[PDB]
Amino acid sequence: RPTFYRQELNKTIWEVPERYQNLSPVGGSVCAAFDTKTGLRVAVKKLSRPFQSIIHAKRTYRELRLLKHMKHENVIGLLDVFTPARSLEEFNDVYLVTHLMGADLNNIVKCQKLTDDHVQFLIYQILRGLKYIHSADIIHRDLKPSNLAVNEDCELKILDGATRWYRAPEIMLNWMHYNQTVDIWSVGCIMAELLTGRTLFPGTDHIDQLKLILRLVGTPGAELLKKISSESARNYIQSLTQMPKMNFANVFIGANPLAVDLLEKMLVLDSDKRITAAQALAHAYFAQYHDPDDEPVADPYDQSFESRDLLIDEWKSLTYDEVISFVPPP
Numbered sequence: 001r002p003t004f005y006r007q008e009l010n011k012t013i014w015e016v017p018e019r020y021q022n023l024s025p026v027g028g029s030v031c032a033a034f035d036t037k038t039g040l041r042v043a044v045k046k047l048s049r050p051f052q053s054i055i056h057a058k059r060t061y062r063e064l065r066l067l068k069h070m071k072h073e074n075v076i077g078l079l080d081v082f083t084p085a086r087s088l089e090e091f092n093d094v095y096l097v098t099h100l101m102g103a104d105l106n107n108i109v110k111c112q113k114l115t116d117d118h119v120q121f122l123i124y125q126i127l128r129g130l131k132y133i134h135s136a137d138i139i140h141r142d143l144k145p146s147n148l149a150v151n152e153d154c155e156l157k158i159l160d161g162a163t164r165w166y167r168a169p170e171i172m173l174n175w176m177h178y179n180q181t182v183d184i185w186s187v188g189c190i191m192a193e194l195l196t197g198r199t200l201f202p203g204t205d206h207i208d209q210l211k212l213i214l215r216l217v218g219t220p221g222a223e224l225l226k227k228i229s230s231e232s233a234r235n236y237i238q239s240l241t242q243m244p245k246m247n248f249a250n251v252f253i254g255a256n257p258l259a260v261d262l263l264e265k266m267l268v269l270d271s272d273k274r275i276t277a278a279q280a281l282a283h284a285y286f287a288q289y290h291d292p293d294d295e296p297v298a299d300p301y302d303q304s305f306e307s308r309d310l311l312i313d314e315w316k317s318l319t320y321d322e323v324i325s326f327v328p329p330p
């Protein structure tokens with residue numbers, strides 16, 4: 001068992017094993033640090049008050065369960081996890097160690113002239129990562145460029161860290177049923193912004209958002225109005241100047257016509273028609289990169305915990321178990 005050392009960092013105290021040197025803040029909260037066991041440079045997040053409340057403690061436990069299960073290269077992975085505590089009773093603090101990645105898709109897209117080749121490779125890696133996540137019955141629900149870690153090899157990982165811009169219409173008419181293809185909506189929103197340099201749908205709020213979305217894809221016709229339960233929603237949507245679906249080739253006129261088509265298949269209002277990750281990875285656009293023998297799915301994820309109402313000490317303790325049974329990767 002490791003031997004620790006304490007430290008005063010940006011108000012916050014920090015106690016991590018000595019395998020970790022030259023901790024310096026990056027913005028719970030995060031330090032860039034040096035992994036002496038591996039030479040490699042890592043991210044260390046101290047969760048902020050992991051067990052302050054039921055919602056906190058269940059979050060913390062969901063956090064540890066998600067990171068622990070994620071083993072794919074376009075998705076954040078967990079190198080190490082630790083607490084300074086020796087007992088369940090002591091147990092108050094949780095630290096997460098992960099690959100240092102530094103920059104996000106924002107830090108790229110706003111200061112590098114992007115080819116169509118970058119676009120292809122960046123979307124392809126989102127989608128392959130989305131495939132793996134979707135296969136475990138996890139929906140991300142918040143895909144946006146700050147949730148995509150990109151390195152200098154332009155190599156990409158998904159994680160969780162203006163939301164509404166990338167959100168499906170149906171998650172703004174708080175529907176709660178969502179298929180996985182809320183994520184393919186965000187992906188479409190992201191790809192377009194790469195091709196283009198501009199936010200596809202910069203709603204000024206959740207009312208604007210829909211105006212803006214409807215302007216491009218058009219108001220829903222009969223087949224779609226059928227599936228809308230709420231008297232509210234239908235009353236709102238049916239209450240607009242009925243709108244034409246715009247011609248994507250016009251909207252994204254200079255773009256690669258294969259990327260355009262893919263957007264069409266991605267930004268479909270009725271989420272039964274949205275292409276999936278597995279299907280997009282096959283679209284012509286990614287023929288440079290596609291490889292059906294290198295597009296793994298995830299082991300089954302047990303997430304029945306999600307519907308337990310538990311006390312702080314049960315979540316806590318479950319979290320402790322989880323820290324304990326941690327085996328590093330290979």
Ligand SMILES: Cn1nc(C(C)(C)C)cc1NC(=O)Nc1ccc(Cl)cc1
Nearest residue numbers: 030043045066076096098140158159160
């Ligand atoms: C909550 N969550 N969900 C996912 C997905 C959906 C991609 C599996 C990933 C995460 N969690 C994180 O991304 N957690 C995390 C931990 C340390 C750092 Cl430096 C940054 C982020």
